[PDB]
From a paper:
Sialin, a member of the solute carrier 17 (SLC17) transporter family, is unique in its ability to transport not only sialic acid using a pH-driven mechanism, but also transport mono and diacidic neurotransmitters, such as glutamate and N-acetylaspartylglutamate (NAAG), into synaptic vesicles via a membrane potential-driven mechanism. Sialin (SLC17A5) belongs to the solute carrier 17 (SLC17) transporter subfamily that includes nine related transmembrane major facility superfamily (MFS) transporters, all of which are dedicated to anion transport, including the vesicular glutamate transporters 1-3 (VGLUT1–3) and a vesicular nucleotide transporter (VNUT). Sialin adopts a classical MFS fold consisting of 12 transmembrane helices (TMs) with two pseudo-symmetric domains: N-domain (TMs 1-6) and C-domain (TMs 7-12). The Sialin structures in both the lumen-open and cytosol-open conformations reveal a solvent-accessible cavity, which forms the substrate translocation pathway, at the center of the interface between the N-domain and C-domain.
The cryo-EM structures of SialinWT in the apo state were determined at 3.2-Å (pH 5.0) and 2.8-Å (pH 7.5) resolution respectively. The overall structure of SialinWT has the same fold with the recently determined cytosol-open structure of human Sialin19, with a root mean square deviation (R.M.S.D.) value of 0.5 Å. In the cytosol-open state, Phe116 on TM2 forms π-π interaction with Tyr306 on TM7 and Gln123 on TM2 interacts with Thr434 on TM11, leading to a collapse of the translocation pathway in the luminal leaflet. The interaction between Tyr335 on TM8 and Leu309 on TM7 ensures that Leu309 is in a certain conformation to interact with Val58 and Ser61 on TM1 to further lock Sialin in the cytosol-open state. Since Arg39 forms a salt bridge with Glu262 and Lys136 binds to the carbonyl of Val248, two Salla disease-causing mutations (Arg39Cys and Lys136Glu) destabilize the cytosolic opening of Sialin.
Residue numbers in the entry: 36 to 70, 97 to 488
Amino acid sequence: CSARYNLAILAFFGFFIVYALRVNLSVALVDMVDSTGKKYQWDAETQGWILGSFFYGYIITQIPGGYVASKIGGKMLLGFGILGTAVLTLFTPIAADLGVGPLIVLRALEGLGEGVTFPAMHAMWSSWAPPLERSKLLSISYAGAQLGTVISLPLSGIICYYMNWTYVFYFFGTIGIFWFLLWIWLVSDTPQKHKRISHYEKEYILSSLRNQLSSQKSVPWVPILKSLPLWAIVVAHFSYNWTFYTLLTLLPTYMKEILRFNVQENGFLSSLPYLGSWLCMILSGQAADNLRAKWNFSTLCVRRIFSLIGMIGPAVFLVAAGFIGCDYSLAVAFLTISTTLGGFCSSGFSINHLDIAPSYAGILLGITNTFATIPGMVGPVIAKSLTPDNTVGEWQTVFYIAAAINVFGAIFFTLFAKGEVQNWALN
């Protein structure tokens, strides 16, 4: 195809592998711990640390990632982040035998490698994506994350069911390495550095970015963004990610210990939540513009409506799934409905940075992601501290905490967010 669409089809698979390597531990750890592969005697609180150690490195390299990308370009940064994560994943069955310390260190280093991949792709699209086409290209490249989350769970289940849990990490590591080879061979930083680009396509991309590169007055200076219309986005993203990361790391554990599902069924039924979330954030993108064109709705009423939906639907149906516990069908149904409704946040707070202060998208995204990674660090550990064995009441406590946090975040966003370009943002 084209060069920019080849870049978007290789970035799709790169983010597929990023998120697969992130999520495969959630299902492997179900098979790694003891009450065929090797099995370890890790208690409740230890598995919390093993699951949350990824985000301890993930939080570190998201803001430095944009700087290093503007320094050395996005191609090598993204390629080496994913290669580091894949080569480290190849070593998880070895790191688990050395102990818990080396396992959480390995997993935190994987987080370090993965944190630097979204800033790198942003840097690449800054010079590869023409403005009228930026949405389509960015969406194609970042849909790989959703697909990776959706597919890494059934695959991990199938591999753990027909083979050991070690082959999860072997399979995903070798796929990451093969992708790195493809990426290094086929991609370049800039249309000017691409080897197989056409005359007309390069001319078209360059002329599309030509004077918009002149319009970049937001480069040399950034103000003090400590404005409560931004802390609203930060608090909403934190409250969303508490539930998101808690469930992303501990849904296979819940479905094994409470609903009593086989590993294969565990993966297949843990993928439905995120498939629903993907489809819902696809359809909400259209529902939002229909709601903003059919009626005006001020572009902030749209934001707070979609955040209210996507942050109170999850809370309500999470307390519902906790209340109905030990009923496999309704529990899985409600665990699907909650994180399905959680996709309205895609046109809720998730894009309020693109209208509270555009031309600062990278800085504001880095800030909100750095502050919203903390739920990934503390949520799994809290949930494993509250639930020593299963005790459906304990998982009910966990779900009530996550739901209360979602409700608080939705209220805080709907009270304090704004929809206009802020003062300090105008060049």
